[PDB]
Design a protein around this ligand. Structure first.
Ligand SMILES: N[C@@H](CC(=O)O)C(=O)O
Ligand SMILES: [Mg+2]
Ligand SMILES: [Mg+2]
Ligand SMILES: [Mg+2]
Ligand SMILES: [Mg+2]
Ligand SMILES: [Mg+2]
Ligand SMILES: [Mg+2]
Ligand SMILES: [Mg+2]
Ligand SMILES: [Mg+2]
Ligand SMILES: [Mg+2]
Ligand SMILES: [Mg+2]
Ligand SMILES: [Mg+2]
Ligand SMILES: [Mg+2]
Ligand SMILES: [Mg+2]
Ligand SMILES: [Mg+2]
Ligand SMILES: [Mg+2]
Ligand SMILES: [Mg+2]
Ligand SMILES: [Mg+2]
Ligand SMILES: [Mg+2]
Lengths: 153, 70, 66, 116
RNA sequence: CUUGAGUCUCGUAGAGGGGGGUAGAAUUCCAGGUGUAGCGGUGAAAUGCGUAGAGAUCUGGAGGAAUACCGGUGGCGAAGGCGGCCCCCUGGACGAAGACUGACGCUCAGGUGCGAAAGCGUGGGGAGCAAACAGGAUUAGAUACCCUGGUAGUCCACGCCGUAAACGAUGUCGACUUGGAGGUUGUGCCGGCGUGGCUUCCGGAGCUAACGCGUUAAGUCGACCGCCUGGGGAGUACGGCCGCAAGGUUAAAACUCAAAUGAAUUGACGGGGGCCCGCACAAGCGGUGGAGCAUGUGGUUUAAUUCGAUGCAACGCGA
């Protein structure tokens, strides 16, 4: 806004693991205010993710974020009628939000039956750079690298 | 702007001395002034306008030293 | 400031006097404005006239890229 | 094929393009690169980043001559004046001199102003 | 007669003018070397140039035009104008100490001359630029703006043209009337005190419709000249004169309107500027526009489909 009186809003950590990061994943996946319906999807998907990779409940989700988190994005800007896409580094908080949003949006447009398996299928693919969530991360990185010449105002 | 690199001088300091030498001679100012033709009627007009504003701002600055804003 | 030719009782700047003339040309051979060296207007015209005469005799250079 | 070890870099920085030519002391070109030929067209061509890449491709294209110290001629008003020189230094050359050789008439009539 | 006007003596500054020569940078072209795939251009492109070797870089040569820096609301000239450096011929201005002539002045219709640029004629020259023209874009169209090229012309000699927002939109000459801050150029006395010329800005009285001018007046006066009499028609037609032509100059009338206009004020507006704000963008979530149905409206139909609201701010509105 023009005023900048915006402050951070408190988010409770998830009950089963006490993770600030994972609670936001539930919120992004939540639809129509149905948080309970979304926790069962997140918890049963990470249960599948842990038993399929054996790493753990928590850092198995994190290693998926490492391969989806963007490092630089382009912001549109017009000078002479044609728009210049200016690459800008992404702050750490927005890196998680973009990663979680891409994972959820990539998962939703999949072919699996249950969303819990649909999410776990996409989260597992993020570990070895296969899913469509990491493919959007690549597209953002390539688009930012192509427009690297415009990294100025 | 012929710049000779000196011993034990880092490149950035040597490069910085090159900008200061070029900007001193105003080579980029001459080139931009020469890329298009200037009519003699409009070079006299811009020279006349540059002198009047350097005069006007001086009196505007002088009268500010005789004025308080609060 | 301090136009040096008036303080020295100068009547001509004597293009042959190249030691004096090199104090009024930039490192690229451009004549320094009297606004920078504080030279009187009359002697600045003699100075520019002498520098151009020295340039023609190849005593002074027109530019740095000869 | 031959060894020179001491060349001159001529940066041609114009408002539309940057051309880098690395010659010897005698004025004989060995390799060259341009911002336009470095994969940048139109708006991207006239950026300092494009000129930096041109320097990187020109340094590598002349890598088989074994240049160690390099003199620099900077010509033109383009944005890629300083960026190319810094890229040449990062390439691994010993910069001996940096000289601006932009042509200034003391001349011919310039074209008429564009009424945009 | 000497105070206005002028002459002589000494010097000063100046892009004042005419002729000639010459220097350096740069552009273009030509020949060649190095070298390889782009160059150039634009908001983006394309035309265009380039593997027949361009662009870049270096060497040599040719040619024309203009003189970076100095350079300055700096200087000179009646005005137009005048800008590298040197020589020759030449005009004017100013200053100081006198001497000399003895008002010998000012203005000036007709007349004479000079008079930017474009243009015209004849003969040369031609780098760059560039009307016309061609091509490519842009666009609804684009006989333009932009791009790539490009001929007259721009340069020289002679002759014509005689017009410009030829403007300080302010005729010339003379006198008088508070000040301040400068620039430039002399000159006298000891950086200081004067005294002349030219010139820039601010400002007092005064004047002015106001804006503004203000010792360089648009103030107070005098001398002479030019010009004006509502807007349009119209600086046009016809006639005369001038011109090779283009046209220039002098210069109406019918008719038509009741205004046209100047300055300043308050607003509004600007694809003017500056500073701020709003789910206004941006960052996101979910929608509408597609389907069925509900409802209102328009249209149509009907005997009637009651009337009203009907940009935002009518259309699940009066109901
Ligand atoms: N460039 C110089 C003359 C040549 O070119 C000028 O502008 O006056
Ligand atoms: Mg152009
Ligand atoms: Mg007459
Ligand atoms: Mg002419
Ligand atoms: Mg002719
Ligand atoms: Mg002819
Ligand atoms: Mg053109
Ligand atoms: Mg004039
Ligand atoms: Mg004028
Ligand atoms: Mg008049
Ligand atoms: Mg005034
Ligand atoms: Mg007529
Ligand atoms: Mg007639
Ligand atoms: Mg938005
Ligand atoms: Mg619908
Ligand atoms: Mg109704
Ligand atoms: Mg109605
Ligand atoms: Mg309303
Ligand atoms: Mg409603």
């Amino acid at each position: 806004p023009r005023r900048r009186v915006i402050g951070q809003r408190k988010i409770l950590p998830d009950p089963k693991f006490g993770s600030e990061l994972l609670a936001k994943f539930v919120n992004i996946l939540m639809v129509d205010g149905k948080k309970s319906t979304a926790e069962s999807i997140v918890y049963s998907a990470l249960e599948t993710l842990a038993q399929r990779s054996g790493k753990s409940e928590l850092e198995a989700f994190e290693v998926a974020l490492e391969n989806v988190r963007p490092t630089v994005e382009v912001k549109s800007r017009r000078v002479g009628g044609s728009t210049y896409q200016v690459p800008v580094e992404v702050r750490p908080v927005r890196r998680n939000a973009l990663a979680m949003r891409w994972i959820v949006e990539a998962a939703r447009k999949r072919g699996d039956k249950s969303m819990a398996l649909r999410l776990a299928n996409e989260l597992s693919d993020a570990a070895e750079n296969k899913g469509t969530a990491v493919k959007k991360r690549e597209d953002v990185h390539r688009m930012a690298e192509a427009n690297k010449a415009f990294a100025h105002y | 702007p012929v710049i000779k690199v000196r011993e034990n001088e880092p490149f950035d300091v040597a490069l910085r001395r090159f900008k200061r030498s070029c900007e001193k001679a105003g080579v980029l100012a001459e080139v931009r002034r020469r890329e298009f033709y200037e009519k003699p009627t409009t070079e006299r007009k811009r020279a006349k306008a540059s002198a009047v504003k350097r005069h006007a701002k001086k009196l505007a600055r002088e009268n500010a030293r005789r004025t308080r804003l609060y | 400031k301090f136009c040096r030719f008036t303080a020295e009782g100068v009547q001509e700047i004597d293009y042959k006097d190249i030691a004096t003339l090199k104090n009024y040309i930039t490192e690229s051979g451009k004549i320094v404005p009297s606004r920078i060296t504080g030279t009187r207007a009359k002697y600045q015209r003699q100075l520019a006239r002498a520098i151009k005469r020295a340039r023609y005799l190849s005593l002074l250079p027109y530019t740095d890229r000869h | 094929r031959k060894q020179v070890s001491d060349g001159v870099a001529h940066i041609h920085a114009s408002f539309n393009n940057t051309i880098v030519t690395i010659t010897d002391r005698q004025g004989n070109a060995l390799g060259w690169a341009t911002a336009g030929g470095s994969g940048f067209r139109g708006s991207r061509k006239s950026t300092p980043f494009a000129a930096q890449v041109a320097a990187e491709r020109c340094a590598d294209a002349v890598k088989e001559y074994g240049i160690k110290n390099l003199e620099v001629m900077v010509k033109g008003p383009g944005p890629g004046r300083e960026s190319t020189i810094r890229a040449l230094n990062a390439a691994g050359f010993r910069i001996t001199n940096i000289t601006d050789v932009t042509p200034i008439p003391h001349g011919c009539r310039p074209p008429k102003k564009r009424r945009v």
